[PDB]
Amino acid sequence: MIEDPMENNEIQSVLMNALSLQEVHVSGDGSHFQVIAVGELFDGMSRVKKQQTVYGPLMEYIADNRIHAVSIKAYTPAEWARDRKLNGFLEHHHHHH
Known part of the structure; x- marks a missing residue:
């Protein structure tokens, strides 16, 4: 009584392992997907300090994921x-010096 294919669990597990919060959002288009952690x-926190401490754990996984574009x-x-x-x-990508 349960069946429904849908990956994104990888980035979800890494996102949770890296740093949870409450909810998760694995959005995207087809190649590049944004993984916003809700909570x-x-x-x-600072977008930098955030993405940083957030990338610290999911730094490697992503490093390899490079193949694509898994934002967080x-x-x-x-x-x-x-x-x-x-x-x-x-x-x-708006306004550039």
């Missing part, structure tokens, strides 16, 4: 929509 713990960012639940509604996840 609150990292609700104030520990944010809130509303931070997502807002993020996706922003110009960073819905209009990244």
